[PDB]
Design a protein around this nucleic acid. Structure first.
Length: 54
DNA sequence: CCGTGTGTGTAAAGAGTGAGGCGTATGAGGCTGTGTCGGGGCAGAGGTACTTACCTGGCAGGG
């Protein structure tokens, strides 16, 4: 299995394709939005906390 | 008269929840012990009609 993984190979699990469900699309939209917000907020939150501690 | 454009069977995926049994984990029980801490009483400050009597306002005199 080592030799087969090397030289490249596609195991059966890695080839499974599941058709995307309607609700998964909304879930991904909400996920992207929320994580973009968190990444934008973390810097300002740390800035504010540092200012308060100062 | 042979092109093609649409239907159809029926189990095969595709999810989509849902269910059931089993196996592991937990508990409860005295026991005995030892540090500790919330706890839970524990009392405690500390905040219907008629008649008679009594009181008040008024006008009156007195000095």
């Amino acid at each position: 299995t080592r030799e087969k993984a090397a030289q490249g190979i596609k195991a059966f699990e890695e080839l499974l394709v599941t058709k995307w469900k309607n609700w998964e699309k909304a879930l991904l939209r909400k996920s992207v939005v929320s994580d973009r917000l968190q990444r934008l907020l973390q810097p300002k939150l740390l800035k504010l906390e540092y200012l308060h501690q100062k």
